[PDB]
């Protein structure tokens, strides 16, 4: 067994379905334009900045020093059965250290949220333009009266697809960093290589993951709207969606290593997660809590300068992005750590790819 081995396109039917669906959205935006919606809508028918920059500088510093903050920070919360879970908190801290190291080796990774937000904003602008166009297409008769149903479904699916593409890109970058034996022969552009691998292969996997996510998101939105348009709310399925979203992220990483279809990768990810259920709880409850304290650190320091309320808002928005990638890198680092443990041992010919810090933990 070797990682990053003979990649091939995965989930061809789902990629074809996603392309057909995107062509359908283009057909929506083309029918609206052809009928005249575009012409008859555009034409109609009868000190402060300096602190904001300090948010980026301090947040980027946090991507490289949060590993050390958490090591001594957890202690004061530990001041006063906890002994059983201590080893898992130590594993979380080690994974945070490795995340800091990969950020050191891949400085450009912090800007992935900015590129993803640019793509999402472009798509959202296009979707709002098409929604306004549909608001005047035509009254519109026939079965095409549900073109806006199609459009909303497409908004949800495509937004989830772009977010999952971000997740897959980050997972690929972290996987390339982790499974490379020595770091001095790293690819010249690890992130660009990950993007190329995502585009050429595994696009169907991301499409299927986003489809699965939206299939549950749409019921949640409908339930929320119906409840607002009124007793007891069963919208707690958002927990299922949140849990499903986490499973999808672990499914992309398993797809990035073994180049497996979405079903097999998701099954493997679920098996690994349940096999390490306690470790997953500690990393997602203690690790996440320390990330939240990191966000509070950024906003507090930026607002410590003082009118400037907008500065505090911007620092929070950027902090949620840099920290979000830190949670993505920690989660991907964990699954890569579990795949190595299952498929490899200390014997010769199957040597571990993990770092020294994580070596002692198994």
From Swiss-Prot:
Record's disease association: Neurodegeneration, childhood-onset, with ataxia, tremor, optic atrophy, and cognitive decline: An autosomal recessive neurodegenerative disease characterized by progressive ataxia, tremor, cognitive decline, dysphagia, optic atrophy, dysarthria, as well as urinary and bowel incontinence. Brain MRI demonstrates cerebellar atrophy and leukoencephalopathy.
Topology with respect to the bilayer: Multi-pass membrane protein
Protein known as: Choline transporter-like protein 1
Chief place of localization: membrane
Tissue-level expression: Expressed in various cells of the hematopoietic system.
Family recorded in the similarity comment: Belongs to the CTL (choline transporter-like) family.
pH-linked activity: Optimum pH is 8.5.
InterPro entries: Choline_transptr-like (IPR007603)
Domain of life the protein comes from: Eukaryota
Positions on the Mitochondrial intermembrane side per record topology: 112-113, 165-288
Reaction(s) catalysed by this chain's protein: choline(out) + n H(+)(in) = choline(in) + n H(+)(out); ethanolamine(out) + n H(+)(in) = ethanolamine(in) + n H(+)(out)
Chain segments annotated as transmembrane: 14-34, 47-66, 91-111, 114-134, 144-164, 289-306, 307-323
Gene: SLC44A1
Keyword rRNA processing listed: no
Keyword Hydrolase: no
UniProt function note: Choline/H+ antiporter. Also acts as a high-affinity ethanolamine/H+ antiporter, regulating the supply of extracellular ethanolamine (Etn) for the CDP-Etn pathway, redistribute intracellular Etn and balance the CDP-Cho and CDP-Etn arms of the Kennedy pathway. Involved in membrane synthesis and myelin production.
One GO location term (cellular component): extracellular exosome
One Pfam family here: Choline_transpo
Subcellular location: Cell membrane; Mitochondrion outer membrane
Entry GO MF terms: antiporter activity; choline transmembrane transporter activity; ethanolamine transmembrane transporter activity
Keywords of the record: Antiport, Cell membrane, Lipoprotein, Membrane, Mitochondrion, Mitochondrion outer membrane, Myristate, Neurodegeneration, Phosphoprotein, Transmembrane, Transmembrane helix, Transport
GO biological process, one term: transmembrane transport
Residue ranges, Cytoplasmic side: 67-71, 85-90
Organism: Homo sapiens (Human)
């Amino acid at each position: 067994w070797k990682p990053l081995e003979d990649r091939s396109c995965t989930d061809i039917p789902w990629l074809l379905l996603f392309i057909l669906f995107c062509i359908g959205m283009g057909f929506i935006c083309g029918f609206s334009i052809a009928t005249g919606a575009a012409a008859r809508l555009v034409s109609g028918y009868d000190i402060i900045l300096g602190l904001c920059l300090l948010s980026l500088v301090l947040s980027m510093i946090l991507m490289v020093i949060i590993r050390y903050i958490s090591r001594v920070l957890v202690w004061i919360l530990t001041i006063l059965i906890m002994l059983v879970m201590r080893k898992r908190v130590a594993l979380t801290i080690a994974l945070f250290h490795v995340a800091g190291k990969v950020f050191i080796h891949l400085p450009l990774l912090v800007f992935q949220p900015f590129w993803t937000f640019f793509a999402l904003v472009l798509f959202w602008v296009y979707w709002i333009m098409t929604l306004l166009f549909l608001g005047t297409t035509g009254k519109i008769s026939g079965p095409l009266q549900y073109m806006w149903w199609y459009h909303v479904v497409g908004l949800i699916w495509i937004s989830e697809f772009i977010l999952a593409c971000q997740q897959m890109t980050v997972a690929g970058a972290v996987v390339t960093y982790y499974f490379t034996r020595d770091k001095r022969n790293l690819p010249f552009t690890p992130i660009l290589a990950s993007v190329n691998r995502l585009i050429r292969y595994h696009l169907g996997t991301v499409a299927k993951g986003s489809f699965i996510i939206t299939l549950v998101k749409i019921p949640r939105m409908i339930l929320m709207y119906i409840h607002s348009q009124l007793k007891s709310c069963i919208c707690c399925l958002w927990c299922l969606e949140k849990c499903l979203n986490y499973l999808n992220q672990n499914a992309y990483t398993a797809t990035a290593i073994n180049s497996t279809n979405f079903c097999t990768s998701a099954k493997d990810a679920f098996v690994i997660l349940v096999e390490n259920a306690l470790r997953v709880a500690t990393i997602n409850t203690v690790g996440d809590f320390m990330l939240f304290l990191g966000k509070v650190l950024i906003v507090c320091s930026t607002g410590l300068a003082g009118p400037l309320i907008i500065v505090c808002l911007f620092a929070f928005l950027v902090a949620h992005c840099f920290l979000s990638i830190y949670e993505m890198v920690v989660d991907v680092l964990f699954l890569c750590f579990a795949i190595d443990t299952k498929y490899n041992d200390g014997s010769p010919g199957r040597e571990f790819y993990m770092d020294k810090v994580l070596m002692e933990f198994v």
